Design a protein around this ligand. Sequence first.
Ligand SMILES: [Mg+2]
Ligand SMILES: [Mg+2]
Ligand SMILES: [Mg+2]
Ligand SMILES: [Mg+2]
Ligand SMILES: [Mg+2]
Ligand SMILES: [Mg+2]
Ligand SMILES: [Mg+2]
Ligand SMILES: [Mg+2]
Ligand SMILES: [Mg+2]
Ligand SMILES: [Mg+2]
Ligand SMILES: [Mg+2]
Ligand SMILES: [Mg+2]
Ligand SMILES: [Mg+2]
Ligand SMILES: [Mg+2]
Ligand SMILES: [Mg+2]
Ligand SMILES: [Mg+2]
Ligand SMILES: [Mg+2]
Ligand SMILES: [Mg+2]
Ligand SMILES: [Mg+2]
Ligand SMILES: [Mg+2]
Ligand SMILES: [Mg+2]
Ligand SMILES: [Mg+2]
Ligand SMILES: [Mg+2]
Ligand SMILES: [Mg+2]
Ligand SMILES: [Mg+2]
Ligand SMILES: [Mg+2]
Ligand SMILES: [Mg+2]
Ligand SMILES: [Mg+2]
Ligand SMILES: [Mg+2]
Ligand SMILES: [Mg+2]
Ligand SMILES: [Mg+2]
Ligand SMILES: [Mg+2]
Ligand SMILES: [Mg+2]
Ligand SMILES: [Mg+2]
Ligand SMILES: [Mg+2]
Ligand SMILES: [Mg+2]
Ligand SMILES: [Mg+2]
Ligand SMILES: [Mg+2]
Ligand SMILES: [Mg+2]
Ligand SMILES: [Mg+2]
Ligand SMILES: [Mg+2]
Ligand SMILES: [Mg+2]
Ligand SMILES: [Mg+2]
Ligand SMILES: [Mg+2]
Ligand SMILES: [Mg+2]
Ligand SMILES: [Mg+2]
Ligand SMILES: [Mg+2]
Ligand SMILES: [Mg+2]
Ligand SMILES: [Mg+2]
Lengths: 155, 70, 116
Amino acid sequence: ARRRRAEVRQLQPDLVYGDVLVTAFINKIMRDGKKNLAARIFYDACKIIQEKTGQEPLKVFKQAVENVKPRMEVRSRRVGGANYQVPMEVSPRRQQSLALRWLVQAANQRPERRAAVRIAHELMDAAEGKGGAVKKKEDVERMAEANRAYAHYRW
Amino acid sequence: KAKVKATLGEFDLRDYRNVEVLKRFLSETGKILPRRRTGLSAKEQRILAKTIKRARILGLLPFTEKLVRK
Amino acid sequence: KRQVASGRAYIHASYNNTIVTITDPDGNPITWSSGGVIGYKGSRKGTPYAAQLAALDAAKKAMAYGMQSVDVIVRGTGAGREQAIRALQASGLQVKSIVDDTPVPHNGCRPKKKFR
RNA sequence: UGCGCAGAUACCGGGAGGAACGCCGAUGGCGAAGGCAGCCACCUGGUCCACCCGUGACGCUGAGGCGCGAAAGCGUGGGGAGCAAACCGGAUUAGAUACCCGGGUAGUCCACGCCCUAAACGAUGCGCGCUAGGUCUCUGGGUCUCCUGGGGGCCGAAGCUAACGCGUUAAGCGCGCCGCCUGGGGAGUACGGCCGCAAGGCUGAAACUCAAAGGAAUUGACGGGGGCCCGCACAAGCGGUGGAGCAUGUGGU
Ligand SMILES: [Mg+2]
Ligand SMILES: [Mg+2]
Ligand SMILES: [Mg+2]
Ligand SMILES: [Mg+2]
Ligand SMILES: [Mg+2]
Ligand SMILES: [Mg+2]
Ligand SMILES: [Mg+2]
Ligand SMILES: [Mg+2]
Ligand SMILES: [Mg+2]
Ligand SMILES: [Mg+2]
Ligand SMILES: [Mg+2]
Ligand SMILES: [Mg+2]
Ligand SMILES: [Mg+2]
Ligand SMILES: [Mg+2]
Ligand SMILES: [Mg+2]
Ligand SMILES: [Mg+2]
Ligand SMILES: [Mg+2]
Ligand SMILES: [Mg+2]
Ligand SMILES: [Mg+2]
Ligand SMILES: [Mg+2]
Ligand SMILES: [Mg+2]
Ligand SMILES: [Mg+2]
Ligand SMILES: [Mg+2]
Ligand SMILES: [Mg+2]
Ligand SMILES: [Mg+2]
Ligand SMILES: [Mg+2]
Ligand SMILES: [Mg+2]
Ligand SMILES: [Mg+2]
Ligand SMILES: [Mg+2]
Ligand SMILES: [Mg+2]
Ligand SMILES: [Mg+2]
Ligand SMILES: [Mg+2]
Ligand SMILES: [Mg+2]
Ligand SMILES: [Mg+2]
Ligand SMILES: [Mg+2]
Ligand SMILES: [Mg+2]
Ligand SMILES: [Mg+2]
Ligand SMILES: [Mg+2]
Ligand SMILES: [Mg+2]
Ligand SMILES: [Mg+2]
Ligand SMILES: [Mg+2]
Ligand SMILES: [Mg+2]
Ligand SMILES: [Mg+2]
Ligand SMILES: [Mg+2]
Ligand SMILES: [Mg+2]
Ligand SMILES: [Mg+2]
Ligand SMILES: [Mg+2]
Ligand SMILES: [Mg+2]
Ligand SMILES: [Mg+2]
């Protein structure tokens, strides 16, 4: 984006929860243009999480996402020879994309056999504060506050 | 900002012993203020410099001070 | 073991390091910290973060001697010269005054090639 | 590398010693040039203005001569803080006989005597006379919006210049006098001479060789120059190739 702001795409509300965040999550699950597959994965996982735990799957999806959101990360900046790992804050938009992506990529590293099983279980773990997604978030937040000495390079 | 000569009376530019007036021409630190701030002429500043230095050797005006800020 | 409760804190700020000494009102030191005192070793010592942590280490070391009132003297220019002061203010030490006393010569001594 | 537990760095106090003068400070001043910045006093040179007083062409230039002459360097004796050729290390690097970092001798300072070079530059010899102005400034005098001298700047008339530019501070118009140039390389070399303790300076060729050497300006290219700005160029992101088997094209054989 050299000219313009490259406005954000406006997703369609979820056919089920009327909620956009859900649609985006489905989009990150979808592979090779199979959105029907991805949606059936997500919703069957909603049954899993709503049964194995007696709470609304909506609130757990939001909470699980919310606990993966990183508030700070690190970015390289080329300074006087070799570049530096430089901490700075994370755009709310970027917190969004990173948290959803991390959730999906973590769920597929799970031992569970079926997709919606992994999705449900990772959603539950991440909503409780555990699970691999929350570890990528905790590791990134460890990257900041470690290279904190470069907080003057903010840019 | 007003200038020093503007807010001042008829004073002897050569009197090195008058501290009350000379102290008006030093900065917060002991430095000599440029003509832009003193409003003196080329000749007048040339004379003030010497009389201030004479007064500094007498222990009347300082060579340098400490900045209380920042 | 002294109970001064008031004194001077000297911020020596160069480009390669920032180091803080804390003395009684007669100038005699009590405790001190620096960029190398806290973990940092190399270039990282002259950073403003290391200035913050050095200032705070020395301020906590002053607490045990009872320091509350502190007058700050500052010599030198460099990163984290300001950051050390701002750390000195929120250190819990009440900062009485701040002075810059950085020594400048009247063109007396020939500097190294680096400084011409 | 170096220094620090024999206690450094940082801080306060006392003392020693050498060198240079912050602010003022200027696009400023002075000087024949080199050059001259804390302050006081002594000795001392130049220069400018006002009065229109005195002498009555006593003037200008200037081959030789003589004096001066930044830095570095030379001799003797001091001195020696900081810096710092050479040099000792540490790094970097393909190498590093360097740029960077830790040290360090001469020297940098003083006296006295040498040396005599320089981008010693305004790359513009000195003196006089004539040729629009405007503006900034330093310093005199005046009846003190200003007028009138003497310096230092910037625009610019006429004019000059190849052009850049110069333009009452001439590179314009004139006159006097001195110094100097005559294609590039060889070469500021060789020889002789004069001078120097030395290093070296002043004077200063030839054989040979080349169709050039050069000045200013022009369009363009380029910059590990500047400003501004585009492209899936980077970045953000998603899927790949590089690995396997095979298809196919190429190199090689
Ligand atoms: Mg350092
Ligand atoms: Mg600055
Ligand atoms: Mg300098
Ligand atoms: Mg040791
Ligand atoms: Mg050791
Ligand atoms: Mg030892
Ligand atoms: Mg002392
Ligand atoms: Mg002394
Ligand atoms: Mg000594
Ligand atoms: Mg100055
Ligand atoms: Mg007469
Ligand atoms: Mg007569
Ligand atoms: Mg003459
Ligand atoms: Mg002669
Ligand atoms: Mg000489
Ligand atoms: Mg010399
Ligand atoms: Mg000598
Ligand atoms: Mg000697
Ligand atoms: Mg040294
Ligand atoms: Mg060295
Ligand atoms: Mg070496
Ligand atoms: Mg090596
Ligand atoms: Mg190389
Ligand atoms: Mg010169
Ligand atoms: Mg001529
Ligand atoms: Mg004459
Ligand atoms: Mg003029
Ligand atoms: Mg007048
Ligand atoms: Mg002059
Ligand atoms: Mg004039
Ligand atoms: Mg013309
Ligand atoms: Mg002109
Ligand atoms: Mg005339
Ligand atoms: Mg003329
Ligand atoms: Mg000409
Ligand atoms: Mg020839
Ligand atoms: Mg020569
Ligand atoms: Mg001969
Ligand atoms: Mg000879
Ligand atoms: Mg001889
Ligand atoms: Mg030799
Ligand atoms: Mg040319
Ligand atoms: Mg270009
Ligand atoms: Mg390059
Ligand atoms: Mg591309
Ligand atoms: Mg990319
Ligand atoms: Mg392939
Ligand atoms: Mg393998
Ligand atoms: Mg293959």
